[PDB]
């Protein structure tokens, strides 16, 4: 029914180990560029 | 050596977007080897005798 | 004068706290949907109320971005909540409804 | 009609962008080498001849 | 003399942004800088040259399109500001090296 079986599970392991590197790294890449915005401090200074 | 090495990396390899790109490309070739090695070998070790790569010796020539 | 109208008030104060715009320093009039009637009443706001309004919203969208909330101290007390827009908004709709009756004859 | 571009400044400015342009072909070829698995070249590389 | 004369501490450069937004004012002032080496350093001479090449502009400058400086030329042709100036302020062991300008609200990007 499914000769690809062991080939697909092999790619799956890679997919799992690859995502396991990339997801933290892509996250670390976003977290960086938003770090400017995430730590910005507002002050309002109107007259009187 | 253990602190001033991210530094050494950056000067030599990361400043120039050429050497940056060269590093990622040179670095990717070496990674594709080491990964398709290691992970295939991880995948080997989790079956150990389910696969025709191990059976091979049974039916000779 | 009344036990029960203090209760409708307690229901109202509940829903207010429950809505939780307060939690991001907002006032009820900061939260209103901008339609044409609303848009104009913002136009009509005096300098200070306008500048205060832009700051409240700016502070809130900032919190909303960082998924946070004010100190409970710094939230907007239900009683302390001024319907600064109300009279303007009412005057706008009032003017529009006039134009609408005139358009009918 | 490219007579315009022949003078001292232009040769300084080419001479400026030369080490960069050098490395950009290094990037581009080695990428093509890796992406096609060029066989002919890659046999030379220790480690990477996995056969 | 003898008691509690201290030397200056070194000053940490951040690199960082301060934006004080006020649309009631008719033109924008931006001032951008990287960190300078300060008074002593031979690099001041060379930086000052590079600065000189970028130079300065002002809308009262005689003859605009034909200015040597590619900043100042494009600035004048495309009416991209009212003023700019390069600078290198020195302190002991540090300083501010960059430029400051002044322009319309729709120039701030192009000028940048």
Swiss-Prot record, chain A:
Membrane-spanning parts: 5-38
Location within or outside the cell: Mitochondrion inner membrane
Similarity field: Belongs to the cytochrome c family.
Function: Component of the ubiquinol-cytochrome c oxidoreductase, a multisubunit transmembrane complex that is part of the mitochondrial electron transport chain which drives oxidative phosphorylation.
Lineage: superkingdom: Eukaryota
Mitochondrial matrix side: 39-48
UniProt-recorded name of the protein: Cytochrome c1, heme protein, mitochondrial
Subunit-level organization: Component of the ubiquinol-cytochrome c oxidoreductase (cytochrome b-c1 complex, complex III, CIII), a multisubunit enzyme composed of 11 subunits. The complex is composed of 3 respiratory subunits cytochrome b, cytochrome c1 and Rieske protein UQCRFS1, 2 core protein subunits UQCRC1/QCR1 and UQCRC2/QCR2, and 6 low-molecular weight protein subunits UQCRH/QCR6, UQCRB/QCR7, UQCRQ/QCR8, UQCR10/QCR9, UQCR11/QCR10 and subunit 9, the cleavage product of Rieske protein UQCRFS1.
Swiss-Prot record, chain B:
Any Gene Ontology CC annotation: mitochondrial inner membrane
Main location as per UniProt: mitochondrion
Ranges per topology, Mitochondrial matrix: 1-20
One example of a Gene Ontology biological process annotation: mitochondrial electron transport, ubiquinol to cytochrome c
Side of membrane Mitochondrial intermembrane, spans: 47-61
Cited function: Component of the ubiquinol-cytochrome c oxidoreductase, a multisubunit transmembrane complex that is part of the mitochondrial electron transport chain which drives oxidative phosphorylation.
Record's subunit section: Component of the ubiquinol-cytochrome c oxidoreductase (cytochrome b-c1 complex, complex III, CIII), a multisubunit enzyme composed of 11 subunits. The complex is composed of 3 respiratory subunits cytochrome b, cytochrome c1 and Rieske protein UQCRFS1, 2 core protein subunits UQCRC1/QCR1 and UQCRC2/QCR2, and 6 low-molecular weight protein subunits UQCRH/QCR6, UQCRB/QCR7, UQCRQ/QCR8, UQCR10/QCR9, UQCR11/QCR10 and subunit 9, the cleavage product of Rieske protein UQCRFS1.
Protein name per its UniProtKB record: Cytochrome b-c1 complex subunit 9
Gene that encodes the chain: UQCR10
From Swiss-Prot, chain C:
Coarse class of the protein's main subcellular location: mitochondrion
Keyword Glycoprotein attached: no
Listed SUPFAM superfamilies: 14 kDa protein of cytochrome bc1 complex (Ubiquinol-cytochrome c reductase) (SSF81524)
Keywords assigned by UniProt, alphabetized: Acetylation, Electron transport, Membrane, Mitochondrion, Mitochondrion inner membrane, Respiratory chain, Transport
Origin superkingdom: Eukaryota
Residue list for modification N6-acetyllysine: 13, 72, 77, 82, 90
InterPro entries recorded: QCR7 (IPR003197), QCR7_sf (IPR036544)
Keyword Signal: no
Any Pfam family the entry gives: UCR_14kD
Location relative to the cell: Mitochondrion inner membrane
Membrane topology: Peripheral membrane protein
Function: Component of the ubiquinol-cytochrome c oxidoreductase, a multisubunit transmembrane complex that is part of the mitochondrial electron transport chain which drives oxidative phosphorylation.
Subunit structure: Component of the ubiquinol-cytochrome c oxidoreductase (cytochrome b-c1 complex, complex III, CIII), a multisubunit enzyme composed of 11 subunits. The complex is composed of 3 respiratory subunits cytochrome b, cytochrome c1 and Rieske protein UQCRFS1, 2 core protein subunits UQCRC1/QCR1 and UQCRC2/QCR2, and 6 low-molecular weight protein subunits UQCRH/QCR6, UQCRB/QCR7, UQCRQ/QCR8, UQCR10/QCR9, UQCR11/QCR10 and subunit 9, the cleavage product of Rieske protein UQCRFS1.
Family affiliation: Belongs to the UQCRB/QCR7 family.
UniProt protein name: Cytochrome b-c1 complex subunit 7
Lineage, broadest ranks: Eukaryota, Metazoa, Chordata, Craniata, Vertebrata
Curated annotation (Swiss-Prot), chain E:
Segments passing through the bilayer: none
Localization: Mitochondrion inner membrane
Family from the record: Belongs to the peptidase M16 family. UQCRC1/QCR1 subfamily.
Function: Component of the ubiquinol-cytochrome c oxidoreductase, a multisubunit transmembrane complex that is part of the mitochondrial electron transport chain which drives oxidative phosphorylation.
Complexes and interactors: Component of the ubiquinol-cytochrome c oxidoreductase (cytochrome b-c1 complex, complex III, CIII), a multisubunit enzyme composed of 11 subunits. The complex is composed of 3 respiratory subunits cytochrome b, cytochrome c1 and Rieske protein UQCRFS1, 2 core protein subunits UQCRC1/QCR1 and UQCRC2/QCR2, and 6 low-molecular weight protein subunits UQCRH/QCR6, UQCRB/QCR7, UQCRQ/QCR8, UQCR10/QCR9, UQCR11/QCR10 and subunit 9, the cleavage product of Rieske protein UQCRFS1.
Name this polypeptide is given: Cytochrome b-c1 complex subunit 1, mitochondrial
Natural source organism: Bos taurus
Gene transcribed to yield this protein: UQCRC1
Full-protein positions shown: 258 to 369 of 480
């Amino acid at each position: 029914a499914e000769p690809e079986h062991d080939h697909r599970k092999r790619m799956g392991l890679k997919m799992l180990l690859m995502m396991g590197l990339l997801l933290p790294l892509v996250y670390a890449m976003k977290r960086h560029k938003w770090s400017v915005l995430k730590s910005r401090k507002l002050a309002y200074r109107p007259p009187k | 050596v253990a602190p001033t090495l991210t530094a050494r990396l950056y000067s030599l390899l990361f400043r120039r977007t050429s050497t940056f790109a060269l590093t990622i490309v040179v670095g990717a070739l070496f990674f594709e080897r080491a990964f398709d090695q290691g992970a295939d070998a991880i995948y080997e070790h989790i079956n150990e005798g389910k696969l025709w790569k191990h059976i091979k010796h049974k039916y000779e020539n | 004068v009344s036990a029960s109208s203090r209760w409708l008030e307690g229901i109202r104060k509940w829903y207010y706290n429950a809505a939780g715009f307060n939690k991001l320093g907002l006032m009820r009039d900061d939260t209103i949907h901008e339609n044409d009637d609303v848009k104009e009443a913002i136009r009509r706001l005096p300098e200070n109320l306008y500048d205060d309004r832009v700051f409240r919203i700016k502070r809130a969208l900032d919190l909303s971005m960082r998924q946070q909330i004010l100190p409970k101290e710094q939230w907007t007390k239900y009683e302390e909540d001024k319907s600064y827009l109300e009279p303007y908004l009412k005057e706008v709709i009032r003017e529009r409804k006039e134009r609408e009756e005139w358009a009918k004859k | 009609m490219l007579t315009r571009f022949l003078g001292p400044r232009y040769r300084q400015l080419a001479r400026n962008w030369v080490p960069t342009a050098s490395l950009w072909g290094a990037v581009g070829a080695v990428g093509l080498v890796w992406a096609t698995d060029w066989r002919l070249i890659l046999d030379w590389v220790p480690y990477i001849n996995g056969k | 003399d003898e008691d509690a004369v201290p030397t200056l501490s070194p000053c940490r450069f951040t690199g960082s942004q301060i934006c004080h937004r006020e649309d009631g004012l008719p033109l924008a002032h931006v001032a951008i800088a990287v960190e300078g080496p300060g008074w002593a350093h031979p690099d001041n001479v060379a930086l000052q040259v590079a600065n000189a090449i970028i130079g300065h502009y002002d809308c009262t400058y005689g003859g605009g399109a034909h200015l040597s400086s590619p900043l100042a030329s494009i600035a004048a042709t495309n009416k991209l500001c009212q003023s700019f100036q390069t600078f290198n302020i020195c302190y002991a062991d540090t300083g501010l090296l960059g430029a400051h300008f002044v322009c319309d609200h729709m120039s701030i990007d192009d000028m940048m």
